[PDB]
Design an enzyme around this catalytic site. Structure first.
Site, PDB file in Angstrom:
ATOM      1  N   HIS A   8       0.857  -1.290  -0.017  1.00 47.86           N
ATOM      2  CA  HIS A   8      -0.142   0.053  -0.042  1.00 47.86           C
ATOM      3  C   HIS A   8       0.699   1.317  -0.032  1.00 47.86           C
ATOM      4  O   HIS A   8       2.078   1.047   0.593  1.00 47.86           O
ATOM      5  CB  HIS A   8      -0.809  -0.149   1.260  1.00 47.86           C
ATOM      6  CG  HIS A   8      -0.236  -0.142   2.571  1.00 47.86           C
ATOM      7  ND1 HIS A   8       0.379   1.106   2.926  1.00 47.86           N
ATOM      8  CD2 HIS A   8      -0.250  -0.835   3.551  1.00 47.86           C
ATOM      9  CE1 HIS A   8       0.931   1.025   4.148  1.00 47.86           C
ATOM     10  NE2 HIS A   8       0.385  -0.195   4.630  1.00 47.86           N
ATOM     11  N   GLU A  74      -0.997  -6.541   7.895  1.00 45.66           N
ATOM     12  CA  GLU A  74       0.609  -6.297   8.477  1.00 45.66           C
ATOM     13  C   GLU A  74       0.660  -7.208   9.729  1.00 45.66           C
ATOM     14  O   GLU A  74      -0.344  -7.640  10.415  1.00 45.66           O
ATOM     15  CB  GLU A  74       0.869  -4.963   8.453  1.00 45.66           C
ATOM     16  CG  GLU A  74       2.462  -4.824   9.055  1.00 45.66           C
ATOM     17  CD  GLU A  74       3.297  -5.197   8.348  1.00 45.66           C
ATOM     18  OE1 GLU A  74       3.666  -4.362   7.249  1.00 45.66           O
ATOM     19  OE2 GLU A  74       3.746  -6.443   8.300  1.00 45.66           O
TER      20      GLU A  74
END
Ligand code: NA
Lengths: 171, 170
Positions: A8, A74
């Protein structure tokens, strides 16, 4: 199988050098810019994304309408969420550097993180684009015997679980 | 999928020529030295290891923090643990060299050994470095039509379950 992993766009903590895991922060202006540059640069394959805002928004700006999966998040840094990399205890620093033996209090161990990531990849039944995070891309790249550091808003294509195919960076 | 099979460093029973299975012996000084030499060779892939001391210590000195799996243990020799290979009863030694069937008293059968080992290998979801024992490395190499002889502290990389990629004998 051909998988395209996308890291991202940047958030404020990227420039601030703070550990960003499950803390749901937004992309910055440049982060959205990086994301728009991905449109037309990625294959039109089914898309999957971390449900975290910065990932979902990257997918959207890239022209995709992904199905959301927390499995693509994550690693959970636990008590280390938001900690400055600079002041991180040397044991944590090296754990992350060597990518092993990391178990933050209140968080997720690197071993648990890897199992989660690889289990998700194992379930994919066809080529897909995955909007995810730096740590997920790193886990995959390292497993394929390569340095897992890739710029925010960049992508990597791999033939899982055999080799890396291409690293895509845009300016 | 790339798998590195690493045979832990030498223990006293290796140089004495005794069957070493679940007896939790420590590495000798040379065994630890062999382990340290692997640090500058093995790729930084996810690591797994037999939970036995000699395998764990090899992984540590090689620069890894492996997940522990008893499925990676050498076969359990039962009453034959520590038995001298040279004086091993012909009926046991024959069984072992025929690779057709084996089940020492108080020990584990080769079928249980293999069930255990291959279940683990087939369950792997990404490339890995496996710190294990001679019998496990043997089993993998033989499954690939190769000879399963790797010195202690050495490794073999394989494209499971197709072929051997390279042997690292130091
Ligand atoms: Na015995």
């Amino acid at each position: 199988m051909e998988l395209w992993l996308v890291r991202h766009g940047e958030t404020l903590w990227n420039r601030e050098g703070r550990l960003l895991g499950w803390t749901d922060l937004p992309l910055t202006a440049e982060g959205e810019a990086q994301a728009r540059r991905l449109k037309g640069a990625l294959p039109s394959l089914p898309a999957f994304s971390s449900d975290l805002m910065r990932a979902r928004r990257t997918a959207e700006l890239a022209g995709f309408s992904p199905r959301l999966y927390p499995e693509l998040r994550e690693i959970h840094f636990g008590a280390l969420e938001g900690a400055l990399w600079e002041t991180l205890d040397p044991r944590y620093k090296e754990a992350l550097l060597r990518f092993q033996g990391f178990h933050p209090p209140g968080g997720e161990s690197l071993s648990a993180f890897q199992e989660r990531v690889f289990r998700f990849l194992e379930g994919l039944k066809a080529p897909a684009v995955l909007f995810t995070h730096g740590g997920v891309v790193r886990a995959v790249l390292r497993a394929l015997g390569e340095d897992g550091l890739v710029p925010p808003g960049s992508a990597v294509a791999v033939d899982w679980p055999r080799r890396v195919l291409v690293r895509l960076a845009l300016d």
